[PDB]
Structures are given as structure tokens and as C-alpha cells.
Ligand SMILES: Nc1nc2c(ncn2[C@@H]2O[C@H](COP(=O)(O)OP(=O)(O)O)[C@@H](O)[C@H]2O)c(=O)[nH]1
Ligand SMILES: Nc1nc2c(ncn2[C@@H]2O[C@H](COP(=O)(O)OP(=O)(O)O)[C@@H](O)[C@H]2O)c(=O)[nH]1
Ligand code: ALF
Ligand code: ALF
Ligand SMILES: [Mg+2]
Ligand SMILES: [Mg+2]
């Protein structure tokens with residue numbers, strides 16, 4: 198946005214701004230939700246896509262509640278800020294303090310005896326560099342249960358995640374790590390469970406820098422091995438050591454490119470992965486979702502003509518219309 | 533491992549048997565089987581652990597489905613027939629002396645019968661290894677559990693692997709080596725998952741934590757190993773098997789045993805744990821736990837001592853002396869395994 202906001206104003210803001218309000222039903226953008234095993238790097242991937250560090254990452258079980266994020270477009274007031282449902286009248290401008298608030302509110306309802314809840318935390322990020330969009334961070338799938346956590350926890354997480362991911366209007370980010378065999382991927386498992394067609398599922402390969410010497414991801418990345426409707430995108434997020442070093446997101450971006458480029462087995466694929474390519478890819482995908490709608494250029498044509506003697510009338514109405522097409526035709530090859 | 537379980541299994545039989553000819557007994561079997569199975573998710577390193585336990589390289593490994601069929605190995609100590617060889621049930625009167633080639637035969641026989649390269653089969657491949665140096669045990673290599681299904685695979689295969697593994701695992705005469713990779717979160721462990729199922733008390737289960745050398749920087753396994761993160765009935769044992777690059781350059785068991793013993797005692801978080809890590813330690817922990825099993829048949833000295841004062845109390849008659857000389861040299865042995873374990 199980048200690409201996607203240009204498209205959005207081109208109607209929703211500036212040129213569907215035309216005459217509405219006579220039974221026009223009805224621009225909902227589908228959510229994007231991360232799924233994958235416990236500690237596959239979901240929170241790291243989601244941050245990267247939003248472009249700022251604001252989600253607790255690490256251990257261990259760290260995301261223990263669904264975190265429903267709504268990005269919100271703002272009257273280009275250079276006034277960027279975040280705000281929680283559970284804390285009205287409180288605005289943040291330091292995403293580290295948002296990150297910290299996410300951790301406290303999560304503790305509030307659980308404890309370091311490591312239980313998960315299904316009641317979401319709601320958070321909004323206001324920005325003129327974003328478009329209206331819900332994003333969803335989720336606790337990772339486990340197989341066991343331990344520390345002290347409930348005995349039921351295993352499928353409680355399985356339903357929580359299923360509860361979001363079921364909805365057809367949900368883009369699924371299936372996060373699988375490259376240091377386990379794909380056959381063992383909880384994320385590939387679940388994203389078949391709910392979206393057999395694999396139609397709204399993008400696959401993300403994390404921890405490529407963590408592979409056993411003698412192995413490499415080339416076969417998965419290059420769609421050789423397990424094949425998806427969309428090409429696998431590989432990422433290198435930052436390490437646990439990098440988390441205690443408080444390495445920042447701009448450093449991690451560089452690092453990530455000093456891997457896909459400086460690694461031999463990967464170089465010929467570099468211009469096609471990293472979190473940035475993934476967000477582009479995500480961008481290009483939802484670009485198609487609203488364009489699919491633009492065959493409402495027929496309801497532009499609805500009026501226009503069948504106005505031509507509706508009484509002069511308005512060469513003015515048929516001036517908006519000119520200017521509507523102006524826009525709904527000056528957004529041709531965005532995808 | 534063998535050593536002190538052969539020099540106590542042998543310090544018997546030459547006791548119970550070659551003495552307690554109190555006829556009409558019952559009956560040296562059952563827990564003179566306890567099979568040992570490796571379980572865990574695909575490629576968590578089951579085969580590597582198993583051969584480390586046996587002591588010879590003879591099982592294929594990788595990276596991708598490699599093990600695709602149960603491999604039941606009942607190993608054999610010989611009449612000091614000091615000549616190492618093995619034989620596959622499926623091709624009899626065939627003796628192998630090349631172990632690198634026994635390995636080749638496990639794959640071929642797997643390929644021949646699975647059809648596809650990623651297909652599995654619950655038809656066990658029966659192997660025996662003859663070497664007068666290692667005692668009488670059954671070992672069972674098994675395909676790693678998986679979650680999805682890749683490539684040229686069935687579908688139910690997820691359930692087919694679970695079922696197959698579960699079948700050698702439900703039976704109580706079975707030791708589980710629950711094999712868990714350290715570079716994943718223990719909460720996501722398939723090994724631990726099924727082990728705790730078929731063995732809730734955790735009584736016949738050993739936790740093996742592999743791939744400790746692959747841990748992401750800024751994490752280590754000390755908490756798991758000191759028994760703080762997931763308590764088991766027996767201390768966790770960490771191993772470092774050969775990596776896929778080692779395999780590709782054919783690094784051998786001696787160099788991998790050297791490697792491992794250098795890892796633990798050289799990396800500073802593990803140094804304090806070193807000599808309770810390593811597959812050689814695992815094998816020791818295993819033999820000892822078998823020792824306890826047998827040693828738990830020796831309130832049998834009581835099914836002796838009966839034959840005693842019930843005869844120390846009793847033209848050809850007093851001949852006795854001998855069945856008492858023998859049932860007192862059984863004390864030479866069954867009283868020379870005393871402080872063992
Ligand atoms: N080295 C490396 N570490 C990673 C990568 N991705 C995630 N991690 C680490 O994985 C652990 C869990 O990451 P997190 O984003 O919280 O995963 P989540 O529980 O799925 O949300 C942390 O210790 C991260 O440092 C990666 O690509 N490379
Ligand atoms: N670096 C490292 N690699 C390992 C370790 N254990 C196993 N591997 C690798 O993991 C892959 C699977 O090993 P394998 O013995 O076949 O495990 P299995 O398939 O469960 O029987 C091979 O590439 C091994 O070299 C370890 O401790 N460290
Ligand atoms: F272990 Al997490 F989100 F904290 F998968
Ligand atoms: F990954 Al395997 F036997 F090849 F568990
Ligand atoms: Mg998380
Ligand atoms: Mg195996």
C-alpha cells in the first residue's frame with residue numbers, strides 16, 4: 198500500500214464516492230491468520246507482514262490467546278497509533294508498549310503455569326500506510342500438555358484455531374519450519390483439514406537457517422516436493438538469541454537477505470522470498486479480491502444512459518460518472 | 533551394555549537350570565525377551581539411536597521416509613563362536629558378514645515390497661545378528677510417525693503408521709525409547725504423545741532427546757535434561773547422532789562416538805551433564821534396567837533352599853552329597869551377583 202491503497206481509494210474512497218444509497222448490497226476484506234505448530238514462528242511471520250515489532254515471540258508457549266488485529270486506514274493524518282478494546286481512552290505510539298500490553302493482558306488471564314484461553318484480545322493499528330484489514334495471531338498446536346496446563350489443552354487449541362480458520366473468508370498462513378520433515382507439519386495438516394482444496398492457503402517455510410547440514414529447502418521452495426495452489430515462500434526470522442539481544446526488525450530484514458542471497462543453494466531463488474516478498478504476494482492476492490468486484494462498472498452503466506431524458510437533467514450526474522470511470526478504469530494492471 | 537548383563541545372565545542359568553533340577557517348575561523366558569522399540573515422529577532419529585545401542589552400523593538413515601517397515605531384530609550371542617554374521621529370515625541359508633551390505637538389504641527388501649518410494653508396510657523384516665559378544669534381546673526399528681502424507685503416499689498412511697507402531701507398543705513386555713528432537717518444542721512431541729498413551733505410568737518408557745547440536749542459538753536443553761521441564765520416571769538421556777552430511781560422507785560409528793563424547797563434555801551448558809549423556813550411557817542405563825528385571829527373579833533362591841533342609845534332613849541312599857554340592861555352588865553364583873544393581 199504500496200499497491201493496495203492506490204486500488205482502494207480508486208473507488209471506496211475517491212470514486213465509488215459517487216451516488217450510493219439505493220439498495221447496493223454490499224468491501225469486506227478476508228482475514229489473514231497464522232497456523233502451525235507451537236513455536237514454528239507464527240508471531241514472527243505476522244509481525245514481519247505488518248512491518249513492526251509488536252507481538253510477543255519466543256519460547257516455549259508464548260502466544261496463548263488469539264490476538265485479533267484490525268488495521269485501519271486514516272484520513273492521512275500523520276498520526277499513527279494503536280489502541281486496545283480492553284483499554285479505552287488509551288492510545289499507544291510505541292509498539293514495544295503494545296507488545297508489552299499484549300503480554301500483561303495475556304498474563305492477567307492465565308499465568309506462567311502456561312494455560313491458553315480462547316477469548317481474543319482486540320487491537321487496532323491506525324495508519325495512512327495501511328488498508329482496512331483483519332489479521333490474526335494464534336497459539337500454536339501442541340500434541341502433549343505439560344507444566345501445569347489443563348489436560349484438555351491439546352484439542353482446545355485445535356478448536357480455537359479451527360474456529361477462526363473455518364470461516365471461508367480467511368486467508369490461511371500455514372507456517373511450517375524447515376528443521377522438521379514436511380510430513381510432520383501440523384500447519385500443512387490443519388490447512389487441509391479446513392481448506393482441502395488448499396484454495397485460500399499460502400505456505401510459509403520458517404527456520405531455513407536452522408537446517409541440519411546435509412539438507413536444504415530448495416525442493417520444497419521450488420515447489421518440487423509438496424505442492425500448493427501458491428508457491429511456498431521461505432523466511433528467516435530472527436533467532437532466540439536475537440530476541441534476547443533485542444535485535445530490531447530492520448536488522449532482521451537485512452540478515453534475512455544476507456541469507457537468501459549469500460547462500461549458494463538459495464541464491465537463484467532470493468528474488469522470490471523473504472517476508473517482504475510474502476507481503477507483496479499477500480498484497481497481489483487481495484488486490485484480486487476487490488478487482489473481482491469491479492464488475493460493478495455495470496451499475497455505473499446502469500444509470501448514465503437511463504438518465505438521458507429523466508425529466509436539462511444532470512450533465513453533472515453524468516460528470517461524476519465520467520469521473521467514476523476515470524478511476525474505475527485508471528487501475529487496470531495492478532495485478 | 534552387554535558385559536554386566538551377560539556376566540549375570542550367565543552367572544545364572546548356570547544356576548537355576550544346571551542346578552535347580554527340582555522337576556515340574558515353570559518355566560528363563562518372558563522377561564528374558566523384553567523387546568526394545570524406538571518410537572517418535574518422522575526423522576527424529578530413531579534408527580540412528582537403535583544402531584548406536586546395538587553397536588554396529590547396519591540400519592539405513594536419512595532425511596525423508598527412510599525406515600518404511602518394522603524391522604524386528606532378535607540378536608544372538610554364540611557359543612563363543614567368535615565370527616560375526618547375520619541372516620534375514622526372508623532369505624535363509626544366507627549368512628552376511630558384510631554389515632554395510634546387510635544395510636543395503638534392508639532397503640532393497642523394503643523397496644521390493646512397498647512399491648512406491650514413500651510407501652510403507654506393516655510386514656516386519658526379520659533379521660538376526662550373530663556375535664558372541666552381545667546378549668539375547670529383541671529390538672524393533674519403526675517408521676517415524678507423520679502428520680500429513682506427502683508425494684506418492686496413500687492417505688490412511690497417517691493412521692497406518694500410527695497403528696503399526698502402536699501394535700508393537702501396547703504389549704507390556706516392551707521397552708519404549710520415546711525419541712524426541714530437541715530442536716522442536718517438547719510440547720509438540722509425537723514420541724512423548726504415544727508413549728504416555730500406551731504407557732501412562734511411564735514405567736517402561738525412556739526419553740531420548742536427540743539433535744541437541746541443532747538447537748537454535750539462545751536456547752539449550754539443560755532444563756529438559758535435569759528433569760525440570762518434563763518429568764519422566766527415569767532421567768532423560770541426550771544424544772548427538774550423525775548429521776545428514778556425515779551420512780553423505782559415510783562417517784563411521786567410532787568417529788560419531790568420538791564426536792558425541794566431545795560435544796557434551798565440550799559445550800559449557802552440558803559439561804556438568806556430560807557423562808550422563810550419550811548413547812553409550814543410554815545403552816548402560818538400558819542394560820541396568822534389564823539387570824533389575826532378571827534380578828527380580830531371584831527370590832528363586834527359596835525354590836532352592838527348599839531343596840536343602842528338605843534333604844539335609846534326609847546300600848545306596850546317602851549318595852545325595854552331589855545334588856547338594858550343586859545346590860550349593862548355585863550359591864557360589866546366586867551369591868556372586870549380590871550387590872549388582
Ligand atoms: N534461527 C531462527 N529462529 C527462529 C526462526 N523463526 C522463529 N524462530 C525462533 O522460534 C521461536 C518461536 O518464534 P515465535 O515467532 O514466537 O513462534 P510462535 O509461537 O509460532 O508464534 C523463537 O525462539 C524464535 O527466535 C527462524 O527463521 N530462524
Ligand atoms: N545434527 C544432527 N542430526 C541428526 C541427529 N540425529 C539424527 N540426525 C539426522 O536426522 C535424519 C534422520 O535420522 P534417522 O536415524 O533415519 O531417524 P529416523 O528416520 O527417525 O529413524 C538424518 O539426516 C540424521 O543424520 C543429531 O543428533 N544431530
Ligand atoms: F509457542 Al507460540 F505462539 F507462543 F506458538
Ligand atoms: F523419519 Al524415520 F524411520 F525415516 F522415523
Ligand atoms: Mg506466537
Ligand atoms: Mg527409523
Ligand code: NA
Pocket residue numbers: 235236254255256257258259260
Ligand atoms: Na513460542
Ligand code: NA
Pocket residue numbers: 574575593594595596597598599
Ligand atoms: Na528419515
